[PDB]
């Protein structure tokens, strides 16, 4: 589970 | 392309020209087959149009019936112009002034208005506006927000005829079934108990299908709204699931989740999360923010649910996004605390595509009938050299005018049932929306992606919201506010960016504005929503309302503007018609194409969805209700996801994400 | 077996003996699992039980619970006997004194009497009445007739409402759909048509599947009727076919026709029929014989439908009938020339099962309830060597019981919709039936298709329907004629043998009960219906009904009769088991089998269907309404079945078929 | 089509 991810 | 002046000639050939004629003939209209007198227009406008003859007729410009493409046409043609036994009886500027009429009646110079703004492309109305105005039951509402009224047998079969019969006419549907007990659950008189939500859901997939009769469209398809406590939410989330037992699909309808904030919490620390049934934990629906989160967690205390792992149902969640594209995102929690309707109860959903945020109950339906701003025509030369200037004054002044139609239609409309009559005569909930944000970044030449387009975004909605509510306030001038203006944050004066905590930009006078609405009230309790426009974009030649563009190819649908500047370059070949095929419609790592068309040409999957994020951030301090936020993810991963979630729910944003499109 | 015995044994081990203390924790039962409250019992019944506990308990002969066979106590305690927490509660005597009470309420006298006869025999009630009766909401009707209330989605919709409320409770339903535009019919406001009756019919189908629940006991299943002029007809016979496309069946429901006499001259004669739609040729369903055939000549005339050869319908009908069993026939013309409830207006379709003929609109949906006296209860020895009497005394006055009964139940029920209330508060139609006649034959030793045999069910029925129209005349005299009495057939003294144009057999004074009748009135508007019996039968150890039998083994049920007469013969060994397994259950073409025996044990199969149409020919003049007549064919062929079809039609039955049983 | 039949 991340919330640091490129988008 | 030239096919487009020949189908448009070549219908003008087919066509009477006269409209008080074409008038008289859809009117005297009657069905061969049956010997049964069938008009298509209503007593009243044609008994208007008869008045009126000559100052009608010789207002319309014919010419203007060129101003649309080939596929724009025959979108025209294949479902929006009148037919008479098989072939189309109306031209272009012909639907223009019924709907013109339809919405204004009697008042003329309105009338002639609408019908110079529309027939110049600067606005169009929704499909069912299109449709239905001017003819006789002139049901011209977008979107009905149903609640499920009870859970019993009864409730649910008065729900379910009201659905048939919202169905049958124009409209989609966002229905909200929080408080239907789940699977497993008691009924009394019986020792046999409830199988649940989806068996229920297969009713609704059923009469949905049933609703849709012959020459298509009469569709008006179904969006269902749960909260993630509900103990059936792993069955309702894979509804359009691709596989699984056939008789536990439904895949006509669409699920989108009512999330609060607590739901985002306990992910985010991977704690707990508890299913219940409404039933053993009941009101949960009927609060939200603080009250939810006290009442929740007492019932979890209290042992009156199943407890599991939060990232469990997280982790399902965003399987069925991945691969089905939904269910929608929209919290519950940002809808309620930032809505002018709070006055009015808890908003327990939103509708069919996510854009309106508006108070329901069983007897009362919440409807919205919705009007498109077309931004490129805005667009002007300065003193030239610049063609660099947009015209605010113009487009503020454009809106003023969609937003006295959006209300002229409430007065107007037929309803299909009582509960959203009853609704909207007391509410008068309008949404004004946009098309063509991506040409009109494109025509400025202004890439996504620039602090000039984020800039421009702004300023556009920012008039908008400030427009309509001018309007609206004048309205309320001449007829007194809507029933329940007492009471709303904005008879508070607390507007729309104020309940974001935040300055407006400034490029209007809100102080002036928020005087006069203490003062006088508003006409409309919500004025904004910013919606699909799906078909009617189509019709005006624009990009889907306020996204970027998904190629500049399709099919060989050729950016106009791409194209343009290629050729403006002479590197625009035969082999030129040969890359962006070959590749999906993108323009980057080509090599011999300037970088300042690179950045200018950004496919949506090219540009940062934390773009995308921070604009509906930054223009959703102007919006009223909500806006149809889809997201898309180049090669989709459960992170990246994840990510982009958390991102736009920290943002506040109410609606997190509607369809979620992949690869 | 002896195995019935140690079941039973070992419920009376598991259960508590004194009926008013299980009366007692079936009333205070409480739902553990929700903390609920759940009582299994009226408040009036357990008051009652209460005031007069000691008369109750001390009735009670719990011997008699050992009169059940095996595979008989098994249903009982499967379905019938009110479980609490899982597990049995009620012991068989229990059930019944539960029922008796639920039907007599305060009137002991009566409900001893009830109790006493039923534990002992004599007769039962129908499943929703062994289900409800004493129970707090006591839905104890079996049979609900439903007319479709108007040609549109409110009407079709607040139809299928209703139905979905009928359905949950107990009760099957016959719902006629005459009145519902076909394929293609014009829709105002429209320029799609109507996709007919199959997709409503789906509609249909999906919601009777959703109103059946989980411990598997609110069925209550859909049979639906059509006259053969509606222009969906072929789709519609073709519902239960196994084949073809998914979208166009129907699995759940039953296609029953309702038959105008034109429609078979026209195909004797071997001429044309014509297809309407209601829509374009209205009134159809409004009149029968004479009138119909005269507005229906006329719309044929004005080129109002689409004709065709009607033995293409015919041979359509045949072949869905073949392959599935269905549509089942029933005849309009016959069903209202003689009935009793023809004052009310025409009557538009049967029931589930094929044997109520009752009167239904929009605002009156007929009811029935249901009780069957068991045959051959009342088979006596004489001043012995005969041991074949028949006491028609005792079964007369038993019948004298069953309606007093099924009258209370009208009063003391509970009605799932205000429809069937008002229907049965009005006309009061009571249906007796019987179970057993074969096991009758069998004990008289009296062949099926044998002369006492047809004799003996003449003089049965004759005083059945001399009993009920006697009690009933009695409760007209305590109570008033039921409320649409003046007017009818019987308050002309038409009674139903006179309908047939028949002197009646004769062993009962019809004129002075005529001559009662016309003086006071009856109570009831009809009174007998012989049905299917499946469940109850079954509980008794008795034979279905009025038919023979199928079998004389099942699974290794053998035939207690033929079993009893082998052995007296010795002949019956253990390579004699051997036999009525390797054939289906038959005797004849045994080498060493007495021809008296052959002939007494014959099979359905072996029964000449042409026997049976008379038998029920007979029985029908003794027959207020209708029954359930199943068929039977060997090696069926098309010219076999339409033979059987005209001579039952010419024959003048009203349901000319039930299931066509085959192979 | 055929009424005669043995049935």
């Given at each position: 589970?991340?919330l640091?991810?490129?988008? | 392309?030239?096919?487009?002046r020949?189908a448009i ?11 008080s ?14 010997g049964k ?16 003859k000559?100052?009608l ?8 019936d060129?101003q ?6 025959k979108?025209?043609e ?5 037919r ?28 002639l208005?609408?019908?110079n703004?529309?027939s ?17 039951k002139?049901?011209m ?12 047998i009864?409730?649910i079969?008065?729900t379910?005829?009201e659905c ?9 549907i966002g229905?909200?079934?929080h ?7 008691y ?11 989806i068996?229920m ?7 949905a299908r049933?609703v ?17 406590w ?6 309702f ?12 699909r439904?895949?006509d ?8 904030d607590?739901?985002?919490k ?12 409404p039933?053993?934990?009941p ?5 939200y ?12 205390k ?7 792992k939060?990232?469990?149902?997280w ?23 930032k809505s002018?309707?709070?006055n009015?109860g808890?908003?327990?959903?939103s ?7 508006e ?6 339906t ?8 077309a ?11 610049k063609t660099?200037?947009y015209?605010?004054?113009k487009?503020?002044?454009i ?32 949404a004004?929306?946009?098309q ?15 602090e000039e387009?984020r800039?421009?975004?702004?300023q556009?909605?920012?008039?908008i919201?400030?427009?309509?509510m001018?309007?609206?306030?004048e ?12 009471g ?11 309940m974001?905590?935040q300055?407006?930009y400034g490029?209007?006078?809100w ?10 009230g508003?006409?409309?309790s ?11 974009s ?7 309302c306020?996204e970027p563009?998904?190629?500049?190819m399709?099919?060989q649908?050729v950016n106009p ?6 050729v ?8 030129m018609?040969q ?6 419609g993108?323009?980057?790592?080509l090599?011999?194409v300037?970088?300042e068309?690179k950045?200018?040409?950004?496919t949506?999957?090219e540009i940062?969805?934390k773009?995308?994020?921070n ?18 993810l180049?090669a989709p991963?459960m ?18 994400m ?6």
């Amino acid at each position: 589970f991340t919330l640091d991810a490129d988008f | 392309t030239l096919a487009a002046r020949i189908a448009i000639s070549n219908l003008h050939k087919q066509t009477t020209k006269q409209f008080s004629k074409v008038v008289e003939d859809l009117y005297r209209y009657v069905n061969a087959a049956t010997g049964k007198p069938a008009p298509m227009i209503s007593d009243d406008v044609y008994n208007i149009v008869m008045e009126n003859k000559d100052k009608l007729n010789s207002a319309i410009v014919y010419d203007r019936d060129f101003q649309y493409s080939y596929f724009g046409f025959k979108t025209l043609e294949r479902s929006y112009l009148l037919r008479i036994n098989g072939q189309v009886a109306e031209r272009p500027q012909h639907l223009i002034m019924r709907v013109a009429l339809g919405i204004h009646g009697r008042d003329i110079e309105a009338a002639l208005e609408t019908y110079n703004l529309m027939s110049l492309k600067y606005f169009t109305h929704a499909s069912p506006t299109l449709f239905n105005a001017g003819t006789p039951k002139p049901q011209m509402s977008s979107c009905f927000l149903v609640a499920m009224k009870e859970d019993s047998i009864e409730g649910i079969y008065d729900t379910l005829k009201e659905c048939a019969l919202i169905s049958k006419t124009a409209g989609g549907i966002g229905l909200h079934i929080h408080n239907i007990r789940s699977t497993g659950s008691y009924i009394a008189g019986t020792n046999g108990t409830s199988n649940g939500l989806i068996p229920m859901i297969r009713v609704f997939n059923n009469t949905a299908r049933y609703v849709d009769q012959g020459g298509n469209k009469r569709p008006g398809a179904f969006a269902l709204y749960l909260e993630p406590w509900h103990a059936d939410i792993f069955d309702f989330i894979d509804i359009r699931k691709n596989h699984g037992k056939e008789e536990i699909r439904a895949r006509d309808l669409f699920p989108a989740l009512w999330i609060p904030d607590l739901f985002m919490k306990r992910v985010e620390e991977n704690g707990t999360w508890t299913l219940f049934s409404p039933t053993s934990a009941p009101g949960l629906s009927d609060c939200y923010g603080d009250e939810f989160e006290a009442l929740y967690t007492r019932y979890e205390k209290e042992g009156r649910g199943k407890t599991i792992k939060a990232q469990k149902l997280w982790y399902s969640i965003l399987e069925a996004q991945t691969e089905t594209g939904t269910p929608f995102v929209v919290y519950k929690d940002a809808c309620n605390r930032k809505s002018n309707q709070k006055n009015l109860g808890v908003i327990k959903s939103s509708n069919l595509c996510c854009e309106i945020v508006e108070y329901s109950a069983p007897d009362e339906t919440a409807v919205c009938n919705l009007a498109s701003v077309a931004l490129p025509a805005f667009i002007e030369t300065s003193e030239d050299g610049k063609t660099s200037t947009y015209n605010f004054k113009k487009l503020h002044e454009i809106a003023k005018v969609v937003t006295r139609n959006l209300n002229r239609v409430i007065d107007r409309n037929y309803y299909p049932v009582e509960e959203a009559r009853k609704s909207n005569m007391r509410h008068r909930p309008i949404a004004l929306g946009v098309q063509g944000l991506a040409d009109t970044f494109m025509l400025l030449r202004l890439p996504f992606d620039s602090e000039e387009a984020r800039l421009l975004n702004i300023q556009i909605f920012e008039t908008i919201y400030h427009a309509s509510m001018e309007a609206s306030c004048e309205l309320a001038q001449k007829d007194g506010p809507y029933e329940t203006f007492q009471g709303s944050p904005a008879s508070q004066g607390i507007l729309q960016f104020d309940m974001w905590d935040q300055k407006p930009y400034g490029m209007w006078d809100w102080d002036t504005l928020r005087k006069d609405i203490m003062k006088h009230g508003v006409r409309n309790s919500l004025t904004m929503a910013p919606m699909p426009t799906a078909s009617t974009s189509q019709i005006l030649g624009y990009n889907e309302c306020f996204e970027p563009v998904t190629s500049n190819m399709y099919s060989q649908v050729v950016n106009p503007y791409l194209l343009r500047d290629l050729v403006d370059l002479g590197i625009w070949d035969e082999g030129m018609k040969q890359y962006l095929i070959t590749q999906n419609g993108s323009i980057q790592g080509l090599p011999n194409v300037p970088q300042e068309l690179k950045d200018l040409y950004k496919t949506v999957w090219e540009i940062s969805q934390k773009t995308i994020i921070n604009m509906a951030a930054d223009r959703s301090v102007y919006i009223d209700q909500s806006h149809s936020l889809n997201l898309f993810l180049r090669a989709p991963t459960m992170g990246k996801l994840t990510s982009m979630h958390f991102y736009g729910w920290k943002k506040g944003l109410k609606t997190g994400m509607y369809y979620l499109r992949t690869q």
